[PDB]
Design a protein around this ligand. Structure first.
Ligand SMILES: NC(=O)C1=CN([C@@H]2O[C@H](COP(=O)(O)OP(=O)(O)OC[C@H]3O[C@@H](n4cnc5c(N)ncnc54)[C@H](OP(=O)(O)O)[C@@H]3O)[C@@H](O)[C@H]2O)C=CC1
Ligand SMILES: NC(=O)C1=CN([C@@H]2O[C@H](COP(=O)(O)OP(=O)(O)OC[C@H]3O[C@@H](n4cnc5c(N)ncnc54)[C@H](OP(=O)(O)O)[C@@H]3O)[C@@H](O)[C@H]2O)C=CC1
Ligand SMILES: NC(=O)C1=CN([C@@H]2O[C@H](COP(=O)(O)OP(=O)(O)OC[C@H]3O[C@@H](n4cnc5c(N)ncnc54)[C@H](OP(=O)(O)O)[C@@H]3O)[C@@H](O)[C@H]2O)C=CC1
Ligand SMILES: NC(=O)C1=CN([C@@H]2O[C@H](COP(=O)(O)OP(=O)(O)OC[C@H]3O[C@@H](n4cnc5c(N)ncnc54)[C@H](OP(=O)(O)O)[C@@H]3O)[C@@H](O)[C@H]2O)C=CC1
Ligand SMILES: Fc1ccc(F)c([C@H]2CCCN2)c1
Ligand SMILES: Fc1ccc(F)c([C@H]2CCCN2)c1
Ligand SMILES: Fc1ccc(F)c([C@H]2CCCN2)c1
Ligand SMILES: Fc1ccc(F)c([C@H]2CCCN2)c1
Lengths: 287, 288, 287, 287
């Protein structure tokens, strides 16, 4: 039987979360700084709380979908003394350190923070294939897990609130870097009469073969094997210089390929030319 | 009827795999490498060791090169460059389209024909039907040597311009290197938190497997200039990349690569794109 | 923290599965009808359970890799009452309805069935490139997902156990038809002095261009667009007659090509000659 | 540079062929039994031939895009004696033996027939990645090869005109079987509330993983290795039975899946049950 809950934060993720909760039949109380972002949900049956404090008071479960944890202090700070007995499921990105700071704040005001990292876009909220990392007090998470199953599948990573944020950041460094490479490929294509649609099949093939290299290098990096049997860093330095010069010749911004070339040059200056590019995970483990 | 003979110059990871696949099929293979040790197994398997690069070029009309760059072709084939007349040089080496076009003009000045190639597979993929390579250059020479080239990978001919195969290779490699640099950063962040690459491999594999959906979602949006903040705002993304930078700094992990990503996203915000999708950053990367 | 589990079914797929589970670090207990198939696995560190019951009792997670769901009854039947509190992940092919029956049977004995459909060959078990459809009670899937992620990536389709079987059959009808076409082309080639290796490049190109046609026809079929702008069915009827007669003139068996001609002739008999071959989806569709 | 030519047959392929030849600057003379199907190409700048006989006399090169070779005899037979010194490039599908008979017929009238098998849809005409098999006298083909390169890449397969047709059918038996498998997947999907767009990703991954299996079985079939290393026919006969029954339980036509199950039952009757499904090529091969 769908338990009622409050949702604060109605950007792309929160609007989708509200629609999924209203589809399962959860009594929903919503609040958003931009009051107009709640209009469609309230027309579908969501209750518009007149203020943030009334949203927190409406239910024990308060789900937050905000840009970061500073936004949580900005919205919940005025009525922080009424956070007693409340379970705050923060589905906002932040560092493990700031996520732990938010958990301390909520606890010092009588509440319980469960940290969440949703690994799906808005279109994936409510879909069975979607998942979210969850960390923080086990008992409070277990009590509200069934409601959270409406949004995504739940993946508990442990009692430390910082864990859900670490696992989110581990995936997002891969996602953002891959997507910035796509934006760079689309720009190179544009300068050469090619649209994103023209490069889509090749771009999709490039990313669809990446799991092979993830396993290939995982086994080796863990065993400390950085041999140049499949690849040598010097060949990669040339490849990335070719990218930089190809983009500059085509009039495309070079700031991001210049940083890549700088990284490969630091690997050669460390004596890794005949080793795999994987050898540079050692430069990364260094502050 | 029978696999054609050919010369292969360049016996590093890719060339070694190419020679093996060419012999596995039944091609008469003449080989040559600067480090002669790398031809030992291929010669044992039945290949002819050319004595001095020139002899290798003279051995066959088809000369396939697997070198680090196009400068390496000039260094090896320059001494006997006048004997390149009538020869078809398939350069499977990475380089800028402009340097690839310069290589083609040099081969042409010496009476030869250059076919440019960009192999989109690792050594383990040479010989596999799954693997492909970009090809560009004079159609007749490509069409004449295609069957032999299909032993190595599938052939994707992009046109008569030799620079086309290099452009398409660079388009895919900027994506590949950036994704794999993110993987190395994820492995380092993981190591600093007691996690091996094997512990994060499930999540890393899911993250890269969901990427084809996002390439399709943003393709039409970027092509139509639709950069609305309906699915995402650059300001949210700037916070996200800042969280990566600081999660990595708090874990003692090198921050030069995440600092470049944060600087890129903060430059978009300072140019008026904060309420737009991160896709709008292609407008700052583009030429106009 | 690699959790322990039991694997029953050590045929081509099960052997690879136990192979990957041991490589990852899982405490594996195994069992097979032909005991000799567990030899290598026990040498590598697996516990050979003396009987089926002991296999089930060793761990909560019991994974089955068998030809069908009938084999689950034959093996787990005798000690079915001890299936209480056990989660049975059945990675065995069967119909959605037979998969749904097995789930009810397991719940009658106090267990929980999670249905699975592995879309990879034995060589791909353990590879991040491989995936599997999973369907069944979400909470039991969430509890055992990390262990199932050792075999392949996990694609949860929903609570209905029949969903993982439906998604598997949707792909296998394409896979089997495509590979029966390969066997036919190899036979045609053989009858004309060409080995499979001689036609392998053209066969690979033919299958590599298929995603384009799948996308081209998807929106068309979904929207009822069966116009003959790219192709007419009468042209296709001649193409498949050309295939049948090429095979007949070369002495190749013609049962499979005659069935293809028969289907296209049914398309013509229904008034679809000037329409795209796509029109024949309406002959296959449920009324 | 762009040589003049005649195009007869303006259905989907010939319309795209004509548009590509006019785009390059080729002087084009067109003719179609349905005169109206030339209207657009004539307004684009092609000359309308009053009769097939004049179309043939207009140029040495006569390209045909017709359903089959019976259409060549019907259209060109009346003025066949005026085919002397003409190069007829027939891009029409037919059996190798009927293509060889068409070449003898053109040669009896003093012309030369070049057989063609275009391996691209109409959207691929003019694309550098598109290709066409070509067979027949090398001299005549190599005289007009550059004009044919405007349509697709030219792949010469040899002097026998039947070779282009054989290589075409080798690929088309794979293409048709894969696409009929797709139509069936789409019908099973529709019966279960799933559109083609919902199954398109899995369908695309299924057909893109096929080149691995093409290589796996190519080597094995050529050396007669048909062991159950990766698969057993009996497991496969159950898989195809699961497909047949899944489709029956969902109300989908079972004619094509029945033909597949019958073929697998012939393999089990030959004692191949414990062998690879690859063993069923011996059932198809010419005695
Ligand atoms: N978008 C995506 O695809 C995904 C994002 N995420 C994560 O989920 C979170 C939310 O995502 P998304 O919906 O895109 O987020 P946005 O950053 O676009 O906005 C989320 C909400 O935060 C509110 N907000 C931000 N700053 C403040 C502040 N100082 N005071 C008050 N309210 C504030 C916004 O209010 P207002 O409506 O007034 O602007 C909005 O409702 C992020 O942390 C993101 O990393 C998770 C996975 C996917
Ligand atoms: N490695 C990979 O996975 C892939 C790489 N590629 C591309 O293929 C090409 C080949 O790279 P790869 O096979 O990895 O190997 P390398 O680039 O490491 O070496 C290739 C060959 O070049 C030779 N060489 C380099 N510089 C010179 C020189 N100045 N004079 C003479 N010979 C020279 C080497 O000789 P020696 O043996 O004596 O060192 C070696 O045989 C590159 O352009 C690369 O971008 C394509 C796709 C995948
Ligand atoms: N093989 C493949 O490439 C793939 C197959 N699959 C699916 O996975 C499942 C297993 O595959 P695969 O390993 O090839 O299967 P097999 O049918 O070849 O063998 C699987 C196991 O089932 C056991 N078994 C079969 N029938 C019975 C029975 N009546 N009673 C008891 N045990 C029985 C066999 O025991 P014993 O050793 O004693 O014979 C064997 O260990 C199938 O459902 C298949 O559709 C999934 C994707 C790929
Ligand atoms: N369409 C495709 O995607 C591909 C098809 N092909 C092959 O190319 C050929 C052309 O196919 P497509 O372009 O689709 O067109 P069709 O096969 O549907 O028709 C082609 C032309 O043949 C003519 N024609 C057919 N029968 C006769 C006859 N008895 N007498 C006179 N003219 C006749 C038609 O004239 P009318 O206008 O009067 O009907 C039409 O212009 C086929 O052999 C096909 O296998 C190869 C590659 C891809
Ligand atoms: F966690 C994920 C996974 C896929 C994706 C995202 C996105 C999408 C745009 C901003 N972030 C986050
Ligand atoms: F998949 C690809 C394609 C081109 C290239 C590579 C490389 C280059 C460095 C190690 N792998 C992989
Ligand atoms: F679903 C899949 C995926 C790969 C593979 C198979 C096979 C292989 C032969 C019997 N089934 C099925
Ligand atoms: F790629 C090819 C080759 C031959 C043929 C086709 C067809 C046939 C039906 C619509 N397209 C495609």
């Amino acid at each position: 039987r769908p338990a009622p809950l409050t949702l604060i934060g109605l950007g792309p993720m929160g609007q989708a979360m509200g629609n999924a909760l209203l589809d399962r039949g959860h009594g929903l109380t919503v609040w958003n700084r931009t009051a107009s972002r709640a209009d469609a949900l309230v027309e579908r049956g969501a209750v518009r709380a007149p203020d943030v404090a009334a949203a927190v008071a409406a239910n024990e479960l308060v789900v937050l979908s905000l840009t970061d944890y500073d936004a949580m202090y900005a919205l919940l700070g005025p009525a922080a003394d009424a956070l007693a007995g409340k379970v705050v499921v923060n589905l906002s990105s932040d560092t493990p350190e700031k996520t732990r700071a938010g958990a301390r704040w909520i606890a010092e005001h009588g509440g319980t923070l469960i940290a969440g990292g949703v690994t799906c876009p808005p279109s994936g909220i409510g879909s069975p294939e979607s998942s979210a990392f969850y960390s923080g007090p086990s008992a409070a998470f277990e009590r509200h897990r069934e409601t959270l199953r409406t949004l995504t599948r739940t993946d508990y990573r442990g009692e430390d609130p910082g864990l859900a944020a670490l696992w989110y950041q581990i995936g997002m460094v891969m996602w953002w870097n891959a997507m910035l490479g796509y934006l760079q490929a689309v720009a190179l294509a544009d300068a050469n009469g090619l649209k994103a649609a023209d490069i889509l099949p090749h771009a999709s093939d490039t990313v669809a073969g990446l799991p092979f290299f993830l396993r290939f290098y995982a086994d080796r990096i863990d065993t400390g094997h950085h041999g140049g049997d499949a690849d040598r860093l010097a060949m990669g330095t040339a490849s990335v210089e070719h990218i930089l010069h190809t983009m500059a010749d085509s009039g495309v911004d070079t700031a991001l390929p210049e940083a890549v070339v700088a990284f490969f040059r630091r690997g050669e200056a460390a004596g890794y030319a005949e080793n795999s590019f994987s050898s540079m995970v050692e430069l990364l483990k260094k502050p």
